[PDB]
Design an enzyme around this catalytic site. Structure first.
Site, PDB file in Angstrom:
ATOM      1  CG  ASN C 190      -1.969   1.052   1.315  1.00 44.23           C
ATOM      2  OD1 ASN C 190      -2.512   1.386   0.175  1.00 44.23           O
ATOM      3  ND2 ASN C 190      -2.536   1.488   2.475  1.00 44.23           N
ATOM      4  CG  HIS C 192      -0.225   6.082   4.018  1.00 46.97           C
ATOM      5  ND1 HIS C 192       0.238   7.099   5.052  1.00 46.97           N
ATOM      6  CD2 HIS C 192       0.118   4.777   4.464  1.00 46.97           C
ATOM      7  CE1 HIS C 192       0.904   6.307   5.880  1.00 46.97           C
ATOM      8  NE2 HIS C 192       0.699   4.851   5.379  1.00 46.97           N
ATOM      9  CG  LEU C 227      -6.862   2.345   7.968  1.00 49.63           C
ATOM     10  CD1 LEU C 227      -6.992   1.922   6.569  1.00 49.63           C
ATOM     11  CD2 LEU C 227      -8.386   2.816   8.098  1.00 49.63           C
ATOM     12  CG  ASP C 228      -3.856   3.571   5.703  1.00 47.00           C
ATOM     13  OD1 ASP C 228      -4.165   2.704   4.933  1.00 47.00           O
ATOM     14  OD2 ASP C 228      -4.621   4.461   5.789  1.00 47.00           O
ATOM     15  CD  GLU C 229      -1.518   2.397  12.718  1.00 46.97           C
ATOM     16  OE1 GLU C 229      -1.487   1.250  13.547  1.00 46.97           O
ATOM     17  OE2 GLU C 229      -1.929   3.340  13.175  1.00 46.97           O
TER      18      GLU C 229
END
Lengths: 285, 284, 284, 285
Positions: C190, C192, C227-229
């Protein structure tokens, strides 16, 4: 041939550049370098102009008087000085000596155009080692929870006695009161570490190490009443890898901290930073 | 509200900024972003001014006409355009496709504000593979030692037919004649590799490899009659290590060429580059 | 003459390098380049070794079988492959194609060695300009709060059908369920963006703009149930100035995201990334 | 627990890694960090291994004696030392102290792990501001066209007396003789600045300024008999703009020179550089 620099900010209005350049032209000066920026969101205009004598040699004091008529009409916050006149800079330090050492090195080799007025600390001189400050005086002003008013008064008196133009918090750890921060608006620069993403609470370097970050950053800013939250002047990062121990993170944190503060200080000292509310306009190069 | 950009250079003299800013002020325009520089060694002054309508919406054609009086008095080389008007750009290519591919990518994603007019080559279309130029036409103009006049005439005619504003030599390997280079002064950009130290003669990549260099560079410049030596727009490097084979050096060489040319192209298209004799003023 | 790459992690113990290198030597292989790192905080050892045949040309399958003996003894997590074998990569995208376009560009010009199996989106084909899509299959797998299990079943089935080795969330904006994440552990990347400091809540770009930040960053990472980690692969930044509007911050955010994701993907594809619990070891 | 570092190069052969790692393992050591590279063009193999004691705490002298058996068999050029043993470094300087000041600054703040044995110059002590010299021995060894042999004999005698392991030419402007260069092979680092492209002849800065360059570079290298053309350790650049005067190019040249020389010196002191004929192998990160 003396060069001068003028910086200014004011509410956006038609004909600012016309007014400023016509003044310099009619007063027999010539523009060497200049930059202008219109912040259409805040409705403010910003200019930096570096100039020297052409048809008329007008001393600084006269040009200021002259330019003050324009500044007043346009509600300008402004400053005009001789590029050769060094700002008087006071360095505040607590325990960490890395920003102090770097500023002094950069000053000594001609990269920071300043006159250090004093090195001021809340800890005794002998807690620092490997330094020869030469003709720069070191002052120890102790402080505790009950003597902040007395200690700030002492620092304030020294700033006045020495005609200090800028105060640098080179990892000085005592928090400045709201009133002292207010008196030093636009004239006090701090440095602190910054991470991607941010860590809050105890042991931020050990949390960063456990998170496996690949960067460590630093932010230099003007001091306000909001702890570490005033107008940002400069930010940068340096690489972190899997090889870096927590001890390595600290060392790299010190390195980016001293790099960002010295660069920020250079922008300030070169009349490249203008306040824009909670932010800054920085005319780089 | 449209934004306009004025760029100019002229012999240094008192009151240039006063004349230019007073003109914009008296014509109801407002300055958004501007930079000035005085080259005191060459005695030339340089300005870039981005502005828009304030108290008066004056069309570009009328502002150009009005500004012409100021330009004549100060002997200015200048250009004024609407920021939204994309320049018409022609790309010349020979064999290497890296610069061509990068520019088209940067254009398609919005990083280069231009209208590609044509892709032109001294080699046939089928010598390139992996491309879909869409609605950008490819032209094959053959040339040999004896047909350079005819080929340049064909290229010149296409430049005029398409109202092309800028020609990019994206590793185009045919040397433009002195007369064509002169016609395209300030409107033709080239890219070439550069080492530290420089290598001259046969096989510069193999000499660089044998020398054990730790950098490879590239230089983007305006084309003049001096082979690969016109006004420098941009230069940059990327790292080389002991791990890099001669093939890796070539690949890194292509990577730095494409980067520096695309960046140089961006500065040109954003009205940030002004000629200064043998040099450039670049407002970054 | 093929090159193979071995990567591994295991609890630290003396003689790991001796065991691995002796195995390659005794099996007639020659080391071309290798890196080793001992994480003394966690007590794990990491190795990456690139090698080729010297005295004996042994097939990959046979080296894998032989190496299995050593991997069992040392409790190693490991992978051995032919460097010419391109990984099969699925690309997931939502409304913005910025990361997808960069990946496809880098693949087409030879910078990323892979086989794109499919482009999967929660939005239809007409959402995209399709630049560089070529003959790569596009699938619109729609999703909402109530169809999540069925949509993930379609993605899970496509992954098996196409023999996909890696899933890249090229700024895909739908959250993968905890079981999906678990199934794709170490095989889903991912991206971000963020700032120094980060911002949460309504209008995050306006917050960054209001704060007057001078940097925008992005983080590439392996996907986990948080989430996102998950494990961070790469991070980088680019400059922000007073000239940048909120729309410019959006643009620069897209730019730093695509740069970091493309680089993180390159490291994965080049067998440079090894998981280290919540972290990574990246042999750059 | 001490950490040790081994670096080596030799003709490429199967089982080098097996031999070296088996030695360290069988001698009760544990690998902390290691790198290997096979230059298939030159047919040479390169390794760096950092290790410490695991089961047997063996002194360095005994490990060297043991490893020497393997080094002989594989025709290895090699070095094993304790990472805590600081190399003894002589600094040579002429009229400009820019590289010298940077090295001394980096040493004083803990960035370069070394013991400066002496500062030697062809100019007197009064030429230098002396910031950060402290108690480092200074020596003015003058030289001219006819006294080169006697001056180098003084330098060669000082190197022996002080037990110096490395000589840094901190922008020292006298050319070392071929024999002097030969004696210091792999142990003498020089620095020089250049451009893309380079320039030769009178007024080289004015030629760069006239050419309109946008970069200035520096190259750190080991000294050989060829003037400024030995094995390259490191190179880097910094930006040049239309705003830079010829005097600004001089300043920036000094800045890029000190940055590149200090980094190259760091790589050398951290046992990251191995000679590869006319080139180097540098294990970074």
């Amino acid at each position: 041939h003396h060069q001068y620099v003028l910086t200014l900010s004011c509410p956006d209005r038609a004909g600012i550049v016309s007014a400023v350049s016509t003044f310099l032209f009619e007063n027999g000066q010539n523009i060497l370098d200049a930059q202008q920026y219109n912040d259409t969101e805040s409705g403010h205009f910003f200019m930096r102009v570096v100039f020297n004598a052409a048809a008329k040699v007008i001393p600084l004091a006269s040009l200021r008087t002259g330019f003050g008529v324009i500044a007043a009409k346009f509600t300008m916050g402004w400053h005009m000085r001789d590029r050769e006149t060094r700002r008087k800079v006071m360095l505040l330090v607590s325990q960490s000596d890395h920003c102090l050492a770097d500023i002094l090195y950069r000053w000594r080799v001609g990269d920071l155009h300043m006159i250090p007025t004093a090195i001021v600390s809340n800890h005794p001189r002998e807690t620092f080692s490997g330094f020869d400050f030469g003709d720069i005086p070191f002052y120890h002003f102790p402080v505790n929870k009950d003597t902040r008013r007395q200690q700030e008064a002492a620092i304030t008196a020294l700033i006045a006695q020495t005609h200090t133009d800028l105060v640098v918090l080179a990892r000085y750890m005592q928090i400045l009161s709201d009133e002292m921060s207010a008196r030093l608006a636009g004239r006090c620069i701090n440095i602190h570490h910054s991470f991607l993403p941010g860590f809050k609470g105890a042991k931020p370097y050990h949390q960063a190490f456990d998170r496996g970050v690949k960067l460590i950053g630093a932010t230099a800013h003007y001091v306000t009443s909001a702890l570490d939250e005033g107008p940002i002047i400069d930010q940068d990062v340096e690489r972190i890898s899997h090889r870096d121990t927590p001890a390595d993170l600290v060392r790299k944190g010190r390195d980016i901290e001293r790099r960002v503060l010295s660069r920020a200080l250079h922008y300030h000292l070169d009349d490249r930073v203008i306040l824009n509310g909670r932010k800054t306009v920085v005319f780089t190069d």
